[PDB]
Amino acid sequence: MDREEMIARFAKFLYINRLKDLLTVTPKRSLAIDWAHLNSFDPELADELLNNPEEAIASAEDAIQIVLREPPLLVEREFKVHARFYNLPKTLLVKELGSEHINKLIQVEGIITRVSEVKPFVEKAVFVCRDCGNEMVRLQRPYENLVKPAKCDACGSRNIELDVDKSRFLNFQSFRLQDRPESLKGGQMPRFVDAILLDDLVDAALPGDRVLVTGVLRVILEQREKRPIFKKILEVNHIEQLSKEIEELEISPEDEQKIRELAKRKDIVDAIVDSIAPAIWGHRIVKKGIALALFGGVQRTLPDGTKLRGESHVLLVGDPGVAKSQLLRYVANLAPRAIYTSGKSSSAAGLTAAAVRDEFTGSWVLEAGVLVLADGGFALIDEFDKMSDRDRSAIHEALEQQTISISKAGITATLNSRTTVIAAANPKFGRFNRHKSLPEQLDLPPTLLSRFDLIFLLLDEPDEKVDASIAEHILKVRRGEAEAVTPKIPYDLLKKYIAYARKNVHPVLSREAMEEIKRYYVKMRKGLRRGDEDGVQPIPITARQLEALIRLSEAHARMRLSETVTREDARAAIEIIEAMMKTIAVDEEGNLDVSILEVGKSSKKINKIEKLVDIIKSLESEGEFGAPEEKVIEAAKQAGIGTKADIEKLLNELKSDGRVYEPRAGFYRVI
Template sequence: MTESEEKVVNVDDAIQGFRDFIEGDEKYVDEINNMIIQRRKSLVIDFHDLLLRNKDLADMLIERPQLAIQAASEAVRQAVTERDPELAKSIKNFYARFKRLPETVPIRKLRSEVLGKLIMVEGIVTRQTPPKHYLKKTVFRCSECGFELEIPQPTTSFVQPPRKCPKCGATNSFVLVEERSELIDWQKIIVQEKPEELPPGQLPRNIEAILLDDLVDTVKPGDRVYLVGIMNLDIAQLRKNKPPILSSFMEVNYVEGQQREFVEIEITPEDERRILEIARSPNVRERIIKSIAPSIYGMENIKEAIACLLFGGVPKVYPDGIRVRGDIHILLVGDPGMAKTQLLRFVAKIAPRAVYTTGKGSSAAGLTAAVVREKDTGEFYLEAGALVLADTGVAVIDELDKMDAKDRVAIHEALEQQTVSIAKAGIVATLNARASVLAAANPAFGRYLPNRTVAENVDLPVTLLSRFDLIFIIRDEPSMERDRAIAEHIVTLHAGEVPESFSDIIPPELLRKYIAYARKHIKPVLTPEARERIVQFYVQMRNKSREPGSPIAITARQLEALIRLAEAEARMRLSPVVEAEDADKAIRLFMSYLSSVGIDVESGKIDIDVIMTGKPRSSQERLALVMDILSRLEEANGGKPVRVEDLYKEAEGAGLDRQFVDKALNMLVKSGDVYMPRPGYVKRVVV
């Protein structure tokens, strides 16, 4: 036996080594005192400190973790007992927990060689069982003679006393003595690898992890965590006449949730220097917009909007406790072959945290949260969906129009309230889904028809459309000059040459770090000048609606969107304040959205009702007139159905043409306000 192996085996030396380490460092002496004041069970030790002070103990911890953790926990118990014997008596178990191991092992790379070793993994908690109770020490008593039998911490899943009492010989007489047995809390979580680390075309891998005692309920589904623990084999799976194939699980020693407000991307001092250098350049905003999908020609407005989505606004909590989102939602509606999916794929790759999904391949449960039955116990537990996993990141949804209507409803709450509420199988929960949503949809008629409203063109409910901050129409219109430029751009790319659009762009990896840095450190505040510009624009737009019969051009919901866009424009420059220039850029972007989507195609005026209700103001008034005429005719007819021909005649007298009446009847039948009891007759639905 070598000298190093002797050191490993000697437990007393290990306990003394940990005692010396704890008592010799003022930081850990203070921590022990805090433990006593707060009546905590665990002392968290930084592995780097242990490595610097005692390399032998650090090596022992990695190679023989069960022994080392047991020795360190005993050292913590002794340190507490010396200072407060009463507390040590009332709390039976004290723990030494270790954080910041030298390297993180990817879940995909967990193999047999890590079994029995102390490792650190990183991932997302997708499932969690309710807390249960684990028998650490079991005491049985013979009901005949009172003989007590103590069984220490079981190594298998079965704890059974002998069939016959060794003292009196009675059979099956042992009963569990709960008050003498030692029970601790137990919980199982499933940790899945992060979506951004998932290789293309692969299913995400996960591991089972066991949390004990004070670690129980410290994390929840959707949390990104670092776990430090020992990989063990599930011995209970060994069965007679079955092949000896076992699965592994992690016995967790320490769990740490990542901060949810920003994404942990490692930014070195060199990266920070380059980021600040980019921010100082006068054309930083133009460079960032150029760097968004440079392989796609043109679309400057859309790329600027996507840049705003990636940087995001600042979430706020009002004094009355109401939270207002800072995330920007964008919908792209366009003709086929206009590179919508390519744009979405780029965003999924460049965003520091992103989850990509398509409408056809997603269900309501897959997007929000599912209630799953545990295979071993049969109990139900929560599994986080795509919007929850994208928390504080970007949820990219392609083919939104192909999603089933019943599944689409699930996105409503996530878009505005940024939470996912679930009530299934006795589980009532609310999870965070603070994600920006970038979605794409195809027009219902194959191509976008300019003479129809956006609600008629897209097969989406207006309640969903109104929650997007910006909606962009991408139309495929022939243009000699533009078509030549696009063709030359694509041909140059296919020839393996670098087009002009790639000059002066920020490399994708650096842009990703730039976005993460901005989201973490920059929280821009509106200057008085920027406030005045936004207020002036809002009042100006509202003034247009003051005349009787005029459409409403803008509402408070759009005002909040405008503020978010202005904050995102400031964040692009890493500016701590939103200046008038940022507000002007946001207003210009917003006007391009209103002038393409929020236009009443008949009157040519900007009308926000086109997006908010699906029907422009002019159409709403004439629709109400059709309902009034139908109501009058019904009364005159004694409440019986009205002939459609009679409705045409009356409507023509009121200045409405036959074509509009047909269109109105179709809309009213669709909305359930009228019905046709027989061909050629209509009747109102009276509630």
């Protein structure tokens, strides 16, 4: 109501320099009126704007046109300028959004998951007819269907057709707003609201970007029985970015003195490891690497065209039947922006992004995955070996270049994937075998395993030793007493500790830490013994692992709130790396990086000269199908390749890739 009274109040309200700067630019067709200036002029005008939002916006449409034709400010070209509201007094959420806010102006914070492309849309659809000069005007909504007169109003010629000359054409883009992961506690599911973007709101942001929208919550498809008003539409009026501190955590100045008190506290590194998951006993090397992955290194920028990452991805291979997820669940309760998902995330996009079909509009819609919504935070994924085929192709770009490049028809994106991935992949067999390599018992590709900085083998006790005896006593205290399960630093205080270090503390390497890292690198590279000739030579350490040693060294200085990296942080990072390189990535006595190629260099030297003696017996043709399999294995045992077992297990991986196939039983030839 009082629609005519709202025009005169908005004309007296219309701050003037922002309108004067608006007419100098041609593409900008919207003024951003703040709500605090509206409450200072007339609070009843602001109160009427909330209950009746459509008539008050239209009252702001024509009243700014009278000000545009004022004797002080007169412009001959008078375009309808939309009114934008900056900061509403109440900031709603998607989880607390209900049916009361329909036809009510609201301010909803959230994160974009779906996006659509730019498509035209008719606002005022006029219809002309043949054999008669009658016309008819009809207005339409983007959520509503295009109405169609069955007959003409004058005579009913059944020739109603849309003319595009006098119709007003606008742009249309539908996006979806979901709840933010940093504001969503575990055990809750994020709700979704399908919104629309009109002429000025088109291409406001990207999927995986957190925005703060103010708009009228419209509604559509209110079928009596066919459909119970299932569809809701947030007609977005003004958009901005809520990353302005509001997204940041609530770090108190009282708690900030408690954070700096932990830095002065002795054995804070030992205190953080004991505080991170004290319910599960043991795995202190795994708890140190998880704590080193919770903090990060400084993302140094190079002018050459790349950016050095500071994310330390840690994959926990482990064993099936051990806990393997309580470390994931407690860290997701502890890490900021953590999204605890599985390998089968029950979504069409998965962990990476994908272009899917939308049910609301037949156009194609790009969905953002788990590695896009968790940007700037953590993405803890369980069952990482069971991952989709499209996700297996984009996992290499998401962990090196921190981007997911997906191309569709009219949809192209380079969505950022700066997520520290704490993954966990079960082996495909029953348990991990110490006599076999790590990628040979894993479904992950070899190039994906080299993307992770630290790999920890969470293997159970092989016998009932003293390690298994004290593992029993802690579980009786945990279940029956519940007195030694409290951490030295509580979960709410440690969550404020990690986010304070990742935001404020940015350490730099010193000359003593540079000397320790350089000495360890040239000592490991000199440890290689040249024991093989005419074949592939093993490498003790790759310079990719040198960049991982720097990131673990800067995370140790960030762990105790230090702005410099000494040699104690370097020596701690070397001991974690040296413990990592002895359990995984180890040929017989040579600590070889087998992760880069899933097989050892001695295994490649065995398999290449096995195919070489398979080739020279194929041209010689001792058998009828070239080289016999019986003749090629006794010459391999003569040449020193091995027994009748390992050559037989070497040839099944030859036919699986196509290197050396078998025509029949007792015959084998190379391709």
